[PDB]
What we know:
Chain A is an all-alpha fold. Chain A has one helix at 2-43. The longest helix of chain A has 42 residues, at 2-43. Chain B has one helix spanning 7-13. The chains hardly touch. The PDB classes it as contractile protein.
Amino acid sequence: RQLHARVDKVDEERYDIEAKVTKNITEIADLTQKIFDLRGKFKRPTLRRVRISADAM
Amino acid sequence: QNGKRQTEREKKKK
């Protein structure tokens, strides 16, 4: 019986920390996409190799 | 003479 109570608890609080890390990761996805965008506008268009043979024709 | 927000909750509950 006390283990049913304890498993009620542990399952509850594990789903707690699970959804914690889970929406932490949802927002990580989100904020990381924001950072990709910003940092990229800073670099990503400028992050490419061009003039490969334009310097040779 | 004398407001219907119980889906994930019940999922976690099960």
